């Protein structure tokens, strides 16, 4: 049982499954068996997991930290576990991982200089690990022995330096001394120049001077120079503003072509203007054919969080070129979102392939994956929906309709769920529509047919209301559907908004009875969700059924579960006998909260 | 027959209780008592006997479920769109009886609710008169035909 789900998550996309599996395990385990059990088992996954390391192991392990934190003890399978599979990526796996799991100074920094000064002798991800548990003069003696070390990967030296610059910010005085120290190689004035520009005076003169130097090895440089240019930035304006312009017509036309590109567009964040804006639209177009001619946007992206700007001529202009061009799709729906409103309005209006306002034809069988450069049509599903996510931000209603039938099922979740919250957002008024109703409870017994049709039961207990009401035969159908499928304690709630006018409240009394015979241990959980149902119910009544199904709960007290507390609780909730039972339950509860303190809670 | 409503339904919880504990006596006396009981009230009585149907003193053992429910049942729509499902998931042993039984079953206990069909219209893919009463039902009713499947039912 436990297990299953244990060798499940360990085995682990591999990801997510570890993950929630792990997540589930640790929390329904619910804290001689519990220790025993937990200890043991996990533990001898500690040990499997760090011989096993791909990742999955890893994974699951560093998942187990978490849960198991969610201090002895810590550290111990912490460092035990992590040591155990550390000496691909499974370094800053770990690293991150123990990081989190001490904070989020001693053995820490023992075992930091040691195999960080271990792997160093020819370390890195090992210096970056210590780097981000220490964060949030030791550090600055460290890494400049480290730095010395390893720089002269130096990518993750660069991790825990930034990371300890960070840290720091009198430590300024050492900082600036190792600064103008290696200012008296490659990667080091890189990141040195990146942490420094990032977080003075000559300082930022000298920067300048090198780095608009070496600007005039490629690629290196490039990034080098690029982010200590933004992060540094009038004169620091206007010689950075000379040197970009330069560079910038230097490289395009001539990779060093985003480069440049990209240091002016921090440029121009960190900012006649429309002649740079123009340059910048044919850059644009450039940069479009670039990621064209690949299939990168991101220019685009980072000048439109510059500033607004340009007005609707270049600024439409470049909207429909760019929007001529996965998320870049995204990006520029966040772009246009902050630009204005036409453009806005505009590319909302275009929804591509294939809608638009006119007209009632032309609407189901879409159907037609019209290739351009084509597909294989799913990606495009995906990101059909998204897409319909962003636009959304009858016609509306059919298409959406047909849309969410056909990529829903199948495979993939997608369309049900998208339109399902978009026509939710869109109509409702619609003052009279047969057709939205009808099709809406369709696609929802539709949903009945997993977590799905869960969250799409939220979405839709949220719109309701009076359509939900005329429903009420299919309401109804959506209330077998409720007590069907477990848990289905995420039916319960739904139900509960039903009320009022409905015939409900009768075979509510029913599940009730049900559940007040039925009385095993899994029994005793559907049994809680259902006292849940009846509390959300907060209709009314069955006054005395409602008592003496209390009287059931009352017995139900008796060991169990927190499932009798809540039963207690919602009992009361709605809304007299009452005091023998109360006293009784109460104050024993109350002596009894060790150890369940939900008890306690409830009896409150 | 009945008395009481309750004296039964407490005592089928002892039996059901029974049930729940492979002894194909067991599935036997099960399916067979289940057939006895028939009308009416037993309801998470019949939501284990759902439950411990999905469980698929074999194959045939759950087939004969899915029978001796359709019977009694002849609402919950609940379970039955479970198992409906559970079913038509094992449908891509007991497949060709299976096929019957759940067939039978749904005819049955159906419909008047197009729904479950239209999607075990597809979840089908992959066995007759289920179809031809199916269709028959959609362009209009027609009653029985279910004599065909099953029989006793012994008085």
Known sequence: ?604 | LEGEFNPHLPTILSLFLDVLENKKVVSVRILKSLVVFGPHLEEYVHLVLPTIIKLSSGNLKKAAIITIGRLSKNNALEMSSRIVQALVRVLNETEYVKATMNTLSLLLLQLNIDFTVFIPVINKTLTIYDRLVAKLLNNEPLPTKIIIDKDFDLP
């Not at chain 1, 040691?114 to 460290?142: D, G, M």
């Not at chain 1, 809406?440 to 047919?449: E, G, P, R, W, Y």
């Not at chain 1, 007040?516 to 006292?531: D, E, F, N």
Request: with cysteine.
């Open chain 1, 1 to 604: 049982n436990v297990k299953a789900f244990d060798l499940i998550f360990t085995k682990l996309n591999q990801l997510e499954r570890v993950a929630a599996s792990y997540e589930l395990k640790s929390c329904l385990i619910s804290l001689v068996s519990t220790e025993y059990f937990q200890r043991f088992s996990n533990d001898i996954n500690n040990k499997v997991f760090e011989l096993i390391h791909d990742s999955n192991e890893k994974l699951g392990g560093v998942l187990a930290v978490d849960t198991l934190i969610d201090e002895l003890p810590n550290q111990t399978s912490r460092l035990a576990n992590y040591l155990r599979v550390l000496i691909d990526i499974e370094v800053m796996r770990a690293a991150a991982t123990t990081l989190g799991k001490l904070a989020v100074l001693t053995s820490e920094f023992v075992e930091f200089e040691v195999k960080t000064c271990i792997e160093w002798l020819t370390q890195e991800y090992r210096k970056h690990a210590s780097l981000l548990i220490i964060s949030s003069y030791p550090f600055v003696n460290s890494i400049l022995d480290n730095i010395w070390r390893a720089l002269r990967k130096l990518v993750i030296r660069t991790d825990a330096a930034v990371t300890l610059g960070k840290c720091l910010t009198s430590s300024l005085t050492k900082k600036w001394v190792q600064r103008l120290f290696n200012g008296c190689i490659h990667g080091t004035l890189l990141v040195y120049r990146q942490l420094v520009s990032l977080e003075l005076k000559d300082k930022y003169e000298e920067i300048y001077e090198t780095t608009m130097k070496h600007r005039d090895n490629i690629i290196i440089r490039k990034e080098i120079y690029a982010i200590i240019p933004v992060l540094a930035a009038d004169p620091k304006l206007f010689t950075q503003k000379y040197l970009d312009a330069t560079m910038i017509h230097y490289l395009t036309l001539l990779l060093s072509d985003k480069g440049p590109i990209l240091v002016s567009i921090g440029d121009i964040a960190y900012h006649i203007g429309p002649y740079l804006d123009a340059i910048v639209e044919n850059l644009r177009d450039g940069l479009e054919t670039k990621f064209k001619t690949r299939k990168e946007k991101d220019i685009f992206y980072c000048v439109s969080k510059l500033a607004c700007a340009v007005r609707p001529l270049l600024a439409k202009y470049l909207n429909r070129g760019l929007l001529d061009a996965s998320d870049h799709m995204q990006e520029t729906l966040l772009v246009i979102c902050e630009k204005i409103s036409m453009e806005v309005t505009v590319n909302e209006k275009l929804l591509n392939i294939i809608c638009l306002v006119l007209s009632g034809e032309k609407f189901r069988p879409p159907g037609s994956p019209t290739p351009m450069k084509s597909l294989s049509s799913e990606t495009a599903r995906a990101y059909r929906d998204q897409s319909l996510l962003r636009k959304t931000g009858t016609l509306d209603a059919m298409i959406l309709r047909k849309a969410l039938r056909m990529l829903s099922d199948i495979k993939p979740k997608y369309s049900l769920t998208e339109f399902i919250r978009r026509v939710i957002i869109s109509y409702m008024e619609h003052d009279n529509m047969q057709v939205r109703k009808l099709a809406a409870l369709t696609s929802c017994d539709l949903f009945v047919k997993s977590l799905y049709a869960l969250n799409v039961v939220s979405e839709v207990l949220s719109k309701l209301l009076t359509v939900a009401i005329t429903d009420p035969v299919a309401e109804i159908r959506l209330e077998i559907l409720k007590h069907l499928d477990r848990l289905s304690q995420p039916d319960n709630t739904k139900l509960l908004f039903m009320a009022l006018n409905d015939e409900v409240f009768a075979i509510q009394m029913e599940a009730m009875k049900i559940c007040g015979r039925l009385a095993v241990i899994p029994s005793l959980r559907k049994t809680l969700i259902q006292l849940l149902t009846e509390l959300k119910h907060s209709k009314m009544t069955r006054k005395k059924e409602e008592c003496a199904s209390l009287l059931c709960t009352l017995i139900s007290s008796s060991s169990d579960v927190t499932k009798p507390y809540l039963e207690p609780v919602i009992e009361i909730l709605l809304p007299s006998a009452v005091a023998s039972t109360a006293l009784k339950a109460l104050g024993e509860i109350s002596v009894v909260g060790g150890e369940d303190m939900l008890p306690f809670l409830d009896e409150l």
